[PDB]
Structure 1
Amino acid sequence: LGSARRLYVGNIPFGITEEAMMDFFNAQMRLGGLTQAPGNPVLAVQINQDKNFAFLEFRSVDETTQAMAFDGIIFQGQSLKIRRPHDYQPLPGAHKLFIGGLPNYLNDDQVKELLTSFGPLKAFNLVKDSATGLSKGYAFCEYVDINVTDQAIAGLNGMQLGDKKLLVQRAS
Protein backbone atom coordinates (compact mmCIF):
# COMPACT_ATOMS: atom_id res chain seq x y z
CA LEU A 1 0.00 0.00 0.00
CA GLY A 2 1.33 3.40 1.07
CA SER A 3 3.36 2.07 4.00
CA ALA A 4 6.39 1.86 1.75
CA ARG A 5 6.07 5.64 1.63
CA ARG A 6 6.01 6.49 5.35
CA LEU A 7 8.69 6.39 8.06
CA TYR A 8 8.55 6.32 11.84
CA VAL A 9 10.85 8.80 13.51
CA GLY A 10 10.99 8.54 17.26
CA ASN A 11 12.84 10.48 19.96
CA ILE A 12 11.86 13.81 18.42
CA PRO A 13 12.76 17.13 20.12
CA PHE A 14 10.11 18.40 22.51
CA GLY A 15 7.64 20.90 21.10
CA ILE A 16 9.10 20.61 17.61
CA THR A 17 6.56 21.74 14.99
CA GLU A 18 5.46 19.47 12.17
CA GLU A 19 6.68 22.08 9.70
CA ALA A 20 10.15 22.28 11.29
CA MET A 21 10.36 18.52 10.93
CA MET A 22 9.42 18.69 7.25
CA ASP A 23 11.85 21.48 6.46
CA PHE A 24 14.66 19.57 8.20
CA PHE A 25 14.12 16.40 6.24
CA ASN A 26 13.55 17.96 2.81
CA ALA A 27 16.74 19.90 3.42
CA GLN A 28 18.75 16.81 4.41
CA MET A 29 17.46 14.97 1.36
CA ARG A 30 18.64 17.84 -0.86
CA LEU A 31 21.99 18.41 0.86
CA GLY A 32 22.84 14.77 0.37
CA GLY A 33 21.64 14.50 -3.21
CA LEU A 34 19.22 11.79 -2.18
CA THR A 35 16.24 12.94 -4.25
CA GLN A 36 15.18 11.11 -7.44
CA ALA A 37 13.40 13.96 -9.20
CA PRO A 38 13.04 17.71 -8.80
CA GLY A 39 10.96 18.90 -5.86
CA ASN A 40 10.67 17.92 -2.18
CA PRO A 41 10.42 14.25 -1.17
CA VAL A 42 8.69 14.78 2.17
CA LEU A 43 5.07 15.79 1.56
CA ALA A 44 3.88 15.81 5.16
CA VAL A 45 4.84 14.90 8.71
CA GLN A 46 2.44 14.22 11.58
CA ILE A 47 3.61 14.51 15.20
CA ASN A 48 2.17 12.75 18.26
CA GLN A 49 3.78 15.03 20.82
CA ASP A 50 3.03 13.01 23.95
CA LYS A 51 4.12 9.72 22.44
CA ASN A 52 7.28 11.54 21.32
CA PHE A 53 7.16 10.45 17.69
CA ALA A 54 6.31 11.55 14.18
CA PHE A 55 5.70 9.85 10.87
CA LEU A 56 7.15 11.19 7.62
CA GLU A 57 5.12 10.91 4.44
CA PHE A 58 7.08 10.66 1.17
CA ARG A 59 6.08 11.04 -2.46
CA SER A 60 8.02 7.99 -3.58
CA VAL A 61 8.92 4.53 -2.33
CA ASP A 62 12.59 4.84 -3.11
CA GLU A 63 13.00 8.19 -1.39
CA THR A 64 11.25 6.71 1.66
CA THR A 65 14.04 4.12 1.65
CA GLN A 66 16.81 6.61 1.01
CA ALA A 67 15.91 8.72 4.04
CA MET A 68 16.57 5.79 6.36
CA ALA A 69 20.30 6.54 6.13
CA PHE A 70 19.43 9.43 8.44
CA ASP A 71 18.89 7.07 11.37
CA GLY A 72 20.48 8.50 14.50
CA ILE A 73 21.04 11.96 13.02
CA ILE A 74 21.36 14.73 15.57
CA PHE A 75 18.53 17.21 15.46
CA GLN A 76 18.07 19.75 18.24
CA GLY A 77 20.08 17.69 20.72
CA GLN A 78 18.03 14.51 20.11
CA SER A 79 19.33 11.51 18.16
CA LEU A 80 16.49 10.45 15.85
CA LYS A 81 15.29 6.86 15.63
CA ILE A 82 14.13 6.29 12.07
CA ARG A 83 12.26 3.03 11.41
CA ARG A 84 9.80 1.66 8.87
CA PRO A 85 6.17 1.54 9.95
CA HIS A 86 5.03 -1.60 11.77
CA ASP A 87 2.36 -2.40 9.18
CA TYR A 88 5.17 -2.31 6.61
CA GLN A 89 6.37 -5.22 4.50
CA PRO A 90 8.09 -5.13 1.07
CA LEU A 91 5.95 -4.53 -2.01
CA PRO A 92 4.83 -7.40 -4.29
CA GLY A 93 7.70 -7.24 -6.79
CA ALA A 94 10.33 -6.34 -4.21
CA HIS A 95 12.48 -9.46 -4.58
CA LYS A 96 11.03 -10.88 -7.81
CA LEU A 97 13.50 -12.99 -9.75
CA PHE A 98 13.97 -13.26 -13.50
CA ILE A 99 14.63 -16.76 -14.79
CA GLY A 100 15.65 -17.09 -18.41
CA GLY A 101 17.17 -19.79 -20.58
CA LEU A 102 14.24 -22.10 -19.93
CA PRO A 103 13.59 -24.78 -22.58
CA ASN A 104 10.50 -23.87 -24.58
CA TYR A 105 8.87 -27.23 -23.76
CA LEU A 106 8.44 -26.94 -19.95
CA ASN A 107 5.10 -25.66 -18.60
CA ASP A 108 4.08 -23.66 -15.50
CA ASP A 109 3.96 -26.64 -13.09
CA GLN A 110 7.26 -27.99 -14.40
CA VAL A 111 9.04 -24.62 -14.20
CA LYS A 112 7.56 -23.94 -10.77
CA GLU A 113 8.80 -27.31 -9.50
CA LEU A 114 12.38 -26.36 -10.33
CA LEU A 115 12.03 -23.19 -8.23
CA THR A 116 9.79 -24.48 -5.39
CA SER A 117 12.72 -26.67 -4.34
CA PHE A 118 14.39 -23.71 -2.59
CA GLY A 119 11.15 -22.83 -0.82
CA PRO A 120 7.50 -21.82 -1.43
CA LEU A 121 6.73 -19.04 -3.93
CA LYS A 122 4.47 -16.05 -3.28
CA ALA A 123 4.21 -15.18 -7.02
CA PHE A 124 5.09 -16.73 -10.40
CA ASN A 125 4.45 -16.23 -14.13
CA LEU A 126 5.89 -17.95 -17.22
CA VAL A 127 5.61 -15.74 -20.29
CA LYS A 128 3.89 -17.36 -23.28
CA ASP A 129 3.65 -15.89 -26.81
CA SER A 130 0.35 -14.02 -27.45
CA ALA A 131 -0.83 -16.19 -30.38
CA THR A 132 1.41 -19.31 -30.32
CA GLY A 133 0.80 -19.73 -26.59
CA LEU A 134 4.00 -21.58 -25.69
CA SER A 135 6.85 -20.54 -23.40
CA LYS A 136 8.96 -17.59 -24.55
CA GLY A 137 11.84 -19.10 -22.56
CA TYR A 138 11.73 -16.95 -19.41
CA ALA A 139 9.72 -16.52 -16.23
CA PHE A 140 9.35 -14.42 -13.11
CA CYS A 141 8.76 -15.59 -9.56
CA GLU A 142 9.22 -14.57 -5.93
CA TYR A 143 9.53 -16.59 -2.70
CA VAL A 144 7.64 -16.01 0.54
CA ASP A 145 10.75 -15.88 2.72
CA ILE A 146 12.52 -13.15 0.76
CA ASN A 147 15.81 -14.33 2.26
CA VAL A 148 15.88 -17.54 0.24
CA THR A 149 16.21 -15.31 -2.85
CA ASP A 150 20.02 -15.26 -2.83
CA GLN A 151 20.23 -18.96 -1.97
CA ALA A 152 18.00 -19.64 -4.98
CA ILE A 153 20.06 -17.39 -7.25
CA ALA A 154 23.29 -19.20 -6.35
CA GLY A 155 21.79 -22.67 -6.77
CA LEU A 156 19.73 -22.08 -9.91
CA ASN A 157 21.80 -19.55 -11.90
CA GLY A 158 23.96 -21.18 -14.56
CA MET A 159 22.30 -24.61 -14.15
CA GLN A 160 22.20 -26.73 -17.31
CA LEU A 161 18.68 -27.41 -18.64
CA GLY A 162 18.45 -29.15 -21.99
CA ASP A 163 21.03 -27.45 -24.22
CA LYS A 164 20.57 -24.14 -22.40
CA LYS A 165 22.31 -22.42 -19.50
CA LEU A 166 19.93 -21.01 -16.93
CA LEU A 167 20.11 -17.34 -15.95
CA VAL A 168 18.83 -16.24 -12.56
CA GLN A 169 19.06 -12.72 -11.17
CA ARG A 170 16.77 -10.22 -9.42
CA ALA A 171 14.37 -8.84 -12.02
CA SER A 172 15.17 -5.21 -11.13
Structure 2
Amino acid sequence: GPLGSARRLYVGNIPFGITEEAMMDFFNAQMRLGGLTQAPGNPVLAVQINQDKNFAFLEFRSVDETTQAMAFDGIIFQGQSLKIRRPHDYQPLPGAHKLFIGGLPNYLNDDQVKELLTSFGPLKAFNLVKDSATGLSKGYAFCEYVDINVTDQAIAGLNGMQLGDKKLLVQRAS
Protein backbone atom coordinates (compact mmCIF):
# COMPACT_ATOMS: atom_id res chain seq x y z
CA GLY A 1 0.00 0.00 0.00
CA PRO A 2 0.68 1.43 2.54
CA LEU A 3 -3.03 2.40 2.24
CA GLY A 4 -3.72 0.82 -1.18
CA SER A 5 -5.87 -2.24 -2.02
CA ALA A 6 -8.11 -1.92 1.08
CA ARG A 7 -11.46 -2.46 -0.70
CA ARG A 8 -10.69 -5.36 -3.07
CA LEU A 9 -10.47 -9.17 -2.68
CA TYR A 10 -9.03 -11.98 -4.86
CA VAL A 11 -11.41 -14.89 -5.61
CA GLY A 12 -9.99 -18.15 -7.01
CA ASN A 13 -11.45 -21.46 -8.19
CA ILE A 14 -14.55 -19.75 -9.66
CA PRO A 15 -17.14 -21.87 -11.56
CA PHE A 16 -16.55 -22.31 -15.31
CA GLY A 17 -18.57 -19.91 -17.49
CA ILE A 18 -19.95 -17.83 -14.58
CA THR A 19 -20.74 -14.16 -15.39
CA GLU A 20 -19.66 -11.04 -13.46
CA GLU A 21 -23.35 -10.28 -12.68
CA ALA A 22 -24.01 -13.77 -11.21
CA MET A 23 -20.95 -13.64 -8.97
CA MET A 24 -21.93 -10.14 -7.77
CA ASP A 25 -25.47 -11.37 -6.96
CA PHE A 26 -24.16 -14.42 -5.06
CA PHE A 27 -21.76 -12.44 -2.85
CA ASN A 28 -24.25 -9.68 -2.07
CA ALA A 29 -26.84 -12.32 -1.04
CA GLN A 30 -24.35 -14.13 1.24
CA MET A 31 -23.26 -10.86 2.89
CA ARG A 32 -26.93 -10.22 3.82
CA LEU A 33 -27.85 -13.77 4.86
CA GLY A 34 -24.60 -14.20 6.82
CA GLY A 35 -25.11 -10.93 8.72
CA LEU A 36 -21.86 -9.30 7.53
CA THR A 37 -23.32 -6.08 6.04
CA GLN A 38 -23.10 -2.91 8.15
CA ALA A 39 -25.68 -0.76 6.38
CA PRO A 40 -28.70 -1.10 4.07
CA GLY A 41 -27.89 -2.05 0.47
CA ASN A 42 -25.29 -4.08 -1.39
CA PRO A 43 -21.61 -4.25 -0.18
CA VAL A 44 -20.17 -5.50 -3.52
CA LEU A 45 -20.10 -2.76 -6.17
CA ALA A 46 -18.37 -4.60 -9.02
CA VAL A 47 -16.74 -7.86 -10.11
CA GLN A 48 -13.98 -8.28 -12.71
CA ILE A 49 -13.28 -11.75 -14.16
CA ASN A 50 -10.22 -13.19 -15.94
CA GLN A 51 -11.69 -16.16 -17.89
CA ASP A 52 -8.38 -17.53 -19.15
CA LYS A 53 -6.80 -17.88 -15.66
CA ASN A 54 -10.06 -18.55 -13.75
CA PHE A 55 -10.04 -15.84 -11.08
CA ALA A 56 -12.02 -12.75 -10.07
CA PHE A 57 -11.58 -9.52 -8.09
CA LEU A 58 -14.44 -8.10 -6.00
CA GLU A 59 -14.68 -4.34 -5.37
CA PHE A 60 -16.40 -3.37 -2.08
CA ARG A 61 -18.02 -0.08 -1.00
CA SER A 62 -16.19 0.06 2.38
CA VAL A 63 -13.01 -1.00 4.18
CA ASP A 64 -14.69 -2.91 7.05
CA GLU A 65 -17.04 -4.99 4.83
CA THR A 66 -14.03 -6.13 2.73
CA THR A 67 -12.40 -7.47 5.90
CA GLN A 68 -15.64 -9.20 7.00
CA ALA A 69 -15.93 -11.04 3.64
CA MET A 70 -12.64 -12.92 4.21
CA ALA A 71 -14.83 -15.21 6.39
CA PHE A 72 -16.32 -16.73 3.17
CA ASP A 73 -13.04 -18.54 2.37
CA GLY A 74 -13.98 -22.04 1.18
CA ILE A 75 -17.69 -21.32 0.52
CA ILE A 76 -19.18 -23.60 -2.17
CA PHE A 77 -20.53 -21.84 -5.26
CA GLN A 78 -21.99 -24.13 -7.98
CA GLY A 79 -19.97 -27.14 -6.73
CA GLN A 80 -16.70 -25.17 -6.34
CA SER A 81 -14.93 -24.28 -3.08
CA LEU A 82 -13.85 -20.62 -3.47
CA LYS A 83 -10.36 -19.35 -2.50
CA ILE A 84 -10.72 -15.86 -0.98
CA ARG A 85 -7.54 -13.80 -0.38
CA ARG A 86 -6.22 -10.26 0.08
CA PRO A 87 -4.69 -8.57 -3.00
CA HIS A 88 -0.94 -9.11 -3.42
CA ASP A 89 -0.39 -5.34 -3.04
CA TYR A 90 -2.31 -5.22 0.28
CA GLN A 91 -0.15 -4.98 3.41
CA PRO A 92 -1.05 -4.46 7.08
CA LEU A 93 0.72 -1.60 8.83
CA PRO A 94 4.17 -2.24 10.41
CA GLY A 95 4.22 -4.16 13.72
CA ALA A 96 0.54 -5.15 13.48
CA HIS A 97 1.29 -8.89 14.08
CA LYS A 98 4.57 -8.78 16.03
CA LEU A 99 5.30 -11.85 18.18
CA PHE A 100 7.14 -12.21 21.52
CA ILE A 101 9.16 -15.47 21.95
CA GLY A 102 10.34 -16.23 25.52
CA GLY A 103 12.07 -19.15 27.28
CA LEU A 104 14.90 -19.72 24.74
CA PRO A 105 18.24 -21.30 25.70
CA ASN A 106 20.71 -18.41 26.14
CA TYR A 107 23.63 -20.16 24.35
CA LEU A 108 21.80 -20.19 20.96
CA ASN A 109 22.69 -17.51 18.36
CA ASP A 110 20.43 -15.53 15.99
CA ASP A 111 20.48 -17.99 13.07
CA GLN A 112 19.85 -20.99 15.38
CA VAL A 113 16.73 -19.34 16.86
CA LYS A 114 15.43 -18.23 13.42
CA GLU A 115 15.58 -21.85 12.24
CA LEU A 116 12.75 -22.82 14.63
CA LEU A 117 10.61 -19.87 13.43
CA THR A 118 11.17 -20.04 9.67
CA SER A 119 9.88 -23.65 9.71
CA PHE A 120 6.37 -22.10 9.67
CA GLY A 121 7.17 -19.59 6.85
CA PRO A 122 9.39 -16.60 5.89
CA LEU A 123 9.95 -13.67 8.28
CA LYS A 124 9.98 -9.96 7.42
CA ALA A 125 11.46 -8.90 10.77
CA PHE A 126 13.44 -10.54 13.60
CA ASN A 127 15.57 -9.58 16.59
CA LEU A 128 17.16 -11.57 19.42
CA VAL A 129 17.70 -9.37 22.47
CA LYS A 130 21.30 -9.41 23.71
CA ASP A 131 23.28 -7.67 26.44
CA SER A 132 25.04 -4.88 24.52
CA ALA A 133 28.31 -4.92 26.51
CA THR A 134 28.94 -8.69 26.35
CA GLY A 135 26.90 -9.57 23.22
CA LEU A 136 25.18 -12.40 25.14
CA SER A 137 21.56 -13.50 24.53
CA LYS A 138 18.90 -12.62 27.15
CA GLY A 139 16.76 -15.55 26.01
CA TYR A 140 13.90 -13.71 24.32
CA ALA A 141 13.21 -12.42 20.82
CA PHE A 142 10.65 -10.67 18.58
CA CYS A 143 9.48 -11.48 15.05
CA GLU A 144 6.98 -10.81 12.26
CA TYR A 145 5.98 -13.21 9.46
CA VAL A 146 5.64 -12.08 5.81
CA ASP A 147 2.28 -13.85 5.61
CA ILE A 148 0.14 -12.69 8.54
CA ASN A 149 -1.93 -15.92 8.43
CA VAL A 150 1.16 -17.89 9.57
CA THR A 151 1.21 -15.97 12.90
CA ASP A 152 -1.52 -18.10 14.55
CA GLN A 153 0.06 -21.29 13.15
CA ALA A 154 3.35 -20.44 14.92
CA ILE A 155 1.57 -19.65 18.20
CA ALA A 156 -0.38 -22.95 18.10
CA GLY A 157 2.75 -24.95 17.16
CA LEU A 158 5.25 -23.41 19.63
CA ASN A 159 3.35 -21.90 22.60
CA GLY A 160 3.56 -23.92 25.81
CA MET A 161 5.87 -26.55 24.26
CA GLN A 162 8.98 -28.19 25.74
CA LEU A 163 12.41 -26.88 24.64
CA GLY A 164 15.12 -28.44 26.78
CA ASP A 165 13.99 -28.07 30.39
CA LYS A 166 12.00 -24.87 29.61
CA LYS A 167 8.48 -24.26 28.29
CA LEU A 168 8.30 -21.72 25.44
CA LEU A 169 6.02 -18.69 25.51
CA VAL A 170 4.93 -17.50 22.05
CA GLN A 171 2.32 -14.72 21.92
CA ARG A 172 1.31 -11.49 20.17
CA ALA A 173 3.62 -8.77 21.55
CA SER A 174 0.74 -6.32 21.99
From 57, 77, 80, the equivalent of 2:79 is 77
Q: Distance in 2 between matches of 1:10 and 1:118?
A: 24
Q: Distance in 2 between matches of 1:127 and 1:79?
A: 44
- Seen in structure 2, the aligned counterparts of structure 1 residues 5 and 102 have a Cα distance that, compared at 3 Å, is farther
- Seen in structure 2, the aligned counterparts of structure 1 residues 22 and 166 have a Cα distance that, compared at 3 Å, is same
Alignment size in residue pairs: 172
Deviations 1:55-89 (A, max 9, x none): 01111111111111100100011110001011110
- Seen in structure 2, the aligned counterparts of structure 1 residues 86 and 120 have a Cα distance that, compared at 3 Å, is closer
- Seen in structure 2, the aligned counterparts of structure 1 residues 40 and 98 have a Cα distance that, compared at 3 Å, is farther
Deviations 1:17-59 (A, max 9, x none): 0010100001000001101111111111100011100001111
Measure how far apart 1:148 and its partner are. 14
Identity of aligned residues (%): 100
Unaligned runs of 5+ in 2: none
- Seen in structure 2, the aligned counterparts of structure 1 residues 130 and 31 have a Cα distance that, compared at 3 Å, is farther
2:127 matched residue in structure 1: 125
- Seen in structure 2, the aligned counterparts of structure 1 residues 61 and 164 have a Cα distance that, compared at 3 Å, is farther
TM (norm. structure 2) is: 0.54
Unaligned runs of 5+ in 1: none
Task: Give the conservation status (yes or no) of the 8 Å contact 1:122–1:143.
Answer: yes
Q: Distance in 1 between matches of 2:62 and 2:149?
A: 24
From 65, 68, 74, the equivalent of 2:67 is 65
Q: Distance in 1 between matches of 2:136 and 2:29?
A: 52
Task: Give the conservation status (yes or no) of the 8 Å contact 2:4–2:89.
Answer: no
Kindly report structure 1 stretches of 4+ aligned residues shifted beyond 3 Å.
91-172
Q: Distance in 2 between matches of 1:9 and 1:117?
A: 28
Task: Give the conservation status (yes or no) of the 8 Å contact 1:123–1:142.
Answer: yes
TM (norm. structure 1) is: 0.54
Task: Give the conservation status (yes or no) of the 8 Å contact 1:4–1:88.
Answer: yes
